[model samples]
Target chain A: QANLMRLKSDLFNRSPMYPGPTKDDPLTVTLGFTLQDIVKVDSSTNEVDLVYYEQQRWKLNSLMWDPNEYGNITDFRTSAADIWTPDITAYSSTRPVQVLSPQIAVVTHDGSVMFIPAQRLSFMCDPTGVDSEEGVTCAVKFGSWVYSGFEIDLKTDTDQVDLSSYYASSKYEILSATQTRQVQHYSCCPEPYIDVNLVVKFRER
Target chain B: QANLMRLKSDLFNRSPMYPGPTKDDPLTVTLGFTLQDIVKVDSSTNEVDLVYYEQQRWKLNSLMWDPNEYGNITDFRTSAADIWTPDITAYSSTRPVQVLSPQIAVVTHDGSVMFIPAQRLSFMCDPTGVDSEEGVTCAVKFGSWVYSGFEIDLKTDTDQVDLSSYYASSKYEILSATQTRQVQHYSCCPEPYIDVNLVVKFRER
Candidate 1:
């Protein structure tokens, strides 16, 4: 009985930390997106209930960017742009011949964020599309861009820099200096650069 | 009896097209090297004979070209003298850092002709190297001068260009084009240039 009382006291006297969102809400913001609540009406009875529902659905479409729709774009629509395309010849000029614009999401832990251009993002296909009867649907090509996410675990003394004008430069500086000199040097002479040759002998056909 | 008589007449009527070379013979330039004979010497007795011999009994090395002995006075080594290296480094100011001096050769097939460089040629390690005790031994390395055999079935109508001058021009042309296009374009966009970022991914350790 004494041990049981001690156990109860220990459990009750432990730190007042709980799993779900707390009253103080120490976390600045959680990084994610959820579908807006939907008002569902029952067919038989005139009963309405609030429940989670898919905000948007996309189909397969070629990635093509329209310069005018840089902003004010939400969900991307996927429909076959080309049904029976002819073989494309080799590029005569050096330019990006294929332009694929996918719809990408932009979410922030903090609410303070600017507009994200629609051209910078891509739309993704449903996971079930791979096994569907229509065969593998090509929503976007292999190198299409998705959403961009950034996270900073700022230390106690860390201060934010004014990186508005020099954002590109700052990014390059950070990426370039991240590696040690030894690692950078070793990475230069990668395995692919090693010279290898193959020789084969066969009788005339 | 008729078949036998015909065969004998054909054999007797066949005549040699060329005369054999005797002592004090005139010099005859050959197109390629062929193995006339291979002899093995017993080290203990120093007696040479043609027979099955151990692998260690034979040693192979490329014949070096001596400037004083050869027709050319200049001793050209590496094709790109601008980018000499004692060891490999990570970032290069040039593209396709030429690992070897490209050698020009005129190859012939029947009456057709083509001029190809050693740089275009490739090599491979022998398959047996995988099972070797000490691993595969490289008979040649990049930048090593070699006298690899080639059959010259056709001769150039014009005189051969100076080897040193030809190599210098080749190196200069490649470097200049890279500097004007690849390097300049990369410096401008860096990230999106040539789809650089798409080809790679980074993860925090």
Candidate 2:
């Protein structure tokens, strides 16, 4: 199957990434990821081709990425500049970070990422600490808010994804409802958003 | 009006800071903003004092801010270390920056910034090119996406603000969403994040 360009690199590596550097500096700190390197918590399988950014800045202007330049890079490296600390460790997604814009890594299996940008919906994630073996958690956020205590145990490899939190939580009260379901890659980073339409998820299957 | 510590300061000013240096070496960049500093796009009038982190890292752990700390004045600074250049010029929020993590200035015209922490909701914002003026945009990701297009046209006397692209887009097709809305001065920089909730434009009404 299609895997995310695991060999991720930054300007430092000369991998003209997705939302490459701004005019300010010349230091590209792109880091590549193997299956082990990425903080996999979105899909159920280990092999994923989609990655999401919490910010989605590249989409904002034409300066970041090029639609014509597909497969041009060593791998698809989006803007990780939003992430300050090189300390990629397991943190709680349920809560926020102290640094204001602490970076989080998200990826998907089954090759849904390629099309995610076209869809225009947002992806929801709930980063659960590495349980059993090592993995993260995610919750698909749509028009309304949903939460679940259920945890996705991303054991050793990609484990069964827990879809509980992807639904609703007491705190995640429904502020607004989704008018429809669409998928788009967002403006700044790659949070790969999509409307939580299970019917579509199954129908596509 | 409690106004965001309109006059807030970071470790470089003293306090050594919270979430103190993950690996200290004399550089202490943190987030900062004054009531007068927020992008000034939110409230049309009156005194204000609320904010979000889109981050909230210092609150996450407890090493950065001090309850007793007061007026360690310098400037109602907004931008930060992630921005290697001192160029506070025109930048677009549409695309992502070279580095994913950016520092911004955030505060509230009402009480939400105060309650933003307790509430787990997210903020949504899109980085527009410093409209009519010149500036950059930023967003701090947590669980949900939030926005504050209130362009704090920080013109005139040391206007307080250094906003970054928070989340969302003109299309707003769920492309991406930022989380937390944190406001911890970064370890050695100004990565302040804020959440934008509408209401109470002015107390007069």
Candidate 3:
């Protein structure tokens, strides 16, 4: 009947001017949902709570390149051969952390499974060579998993709602599943909020 | 490759205004082309001539209606049926004319005719008052057919085109077959042209 927030982030700060505040931004989170946790309802009311844990934090070196200053050959070779230098020295105490060398995972919903490559999951900075005072930003490669939770209230009959009834009755639902990785850009218009964008690629398993 | 005048108007008066001139406008003319006519080269002295007939001066009728002024009825059996009437006939022509009914032909590449209606075709007008100007207009009871002919140019190739291309090609051919019925309405701000706009029902053999 009640929802709980297990992770508190009031002390987390992401300001360049501040020095005393602790900043904790994890790179990735993996989610596993079981049939029992998905379909069950609480006894007190029509509510259910699901739990998720942060699985890992990845540390990798960033390659800085200016699109305006570099030649096409240099940019092409750098993009073709650059490797992610993992920082094995960094660790997290609150949750179990592991260095994932960008592995691909294929998930299926209806009966189809897919396999994606780790290199395809990685993100590249703006090729236009724009810089932000905030810092050099990196896009999350393709294999990075994003966790999002949504609550649906089913206390009332769904059929009685006019909008719901019309949409449910007339719309043909097409089933499509994709694995997405999130990347953040440091510089662009509307500075900070435009940083995050998802890149998704599909593979057949 | 000389372009000659196709059909000339036969009516006594050519101008829209009366008592202006006795010269009549030209009726629609037909254009014809054969594969050999377009592709052949001169055998001896290198002289080639591609010939095709062009028909012009076809009569056209423009019908216009405002949907807001039209009445709506749910059922004709109820008292609300009085709101509906058969007096919606706005324009019609008594001259020798052809009824360009919407026709759909499904044919194979080899020109093998699988099915074609023998006589009598039904055209369904959009009755929901959706496209008022293009929808229900003046009902035509009967019309006389002057001449009917079809042209096929083998020099045209359609193998590499997409679905829209095929549809447009076929539509052009069909429209060419019944070019005499083409009508243009210049009354509206954005002039609307009306051709055969209904799906030709089953062919009557």
TM-score of chain B of each: 0.15, 0.19, 0.14
lDDT of 2 by residue, A19-134 (tens): 42233422211211111011123333322111122111112121233323323222131233422212211121222212222222222121111101101122334334323233
Query: Candidates sorted by TM-score, descending order?
Result: 2, 3, 1
What tens digits encode model 1's per-residue C-alpha lDDT throughout B1-205? 1222232223223542123222333211111111111111122433221111000000111112233332322211111111111121112111232211122121111211111111111122232322333332212112101111121011112221112211211101111100010111334332311100000011111
lDDT of each residue in B34-117, candidate 3, tens digit only: 111111122243322111111111112211122222221100010112111111111232222211111112111121111111
lDDT of 2 at B55: 23
Off by over 4 Å in 1: A1-205, B1-121, B144-205
Arrange candidates by DockQ, highest first: which order? 2, 1, 3
Look at candidate 2 and tell me the lDDT of residue A21: 27
For residue B200, model 2's alpha carbon misses the true position, in angstroms, by 15
| Span of 10 residues, lowest total lDDT, candidate 1 chain B | B51-60
Error of 3 at B68 (Å): 39
Fnat of each candidate: 0.00, 0.00, 0.00
Which has the greatest TM-score? 2
Q: What is the C-alpha RMSD of each candidate to the true structure, in Å?
A: 34.7, 21.2, 31.2
Tens digits of per-residue lDDT for model 3, A1-205 = 0111110011111211111000121222221111111111122111212111112222211222333332321222111112221111100011112222234322121211222121111111221211222322222221211111110000111111112211232111212212222233221112111111221111111
Best by lDDT: 2
- Candidate 2 Cα errors over 4 Å, as ranges: A1-156, A169-205, B1-205
TM-score of chain A of each: 0.13, 0.19, 0.17
Candidate 1: residue B91 Cα off by (Å): 26
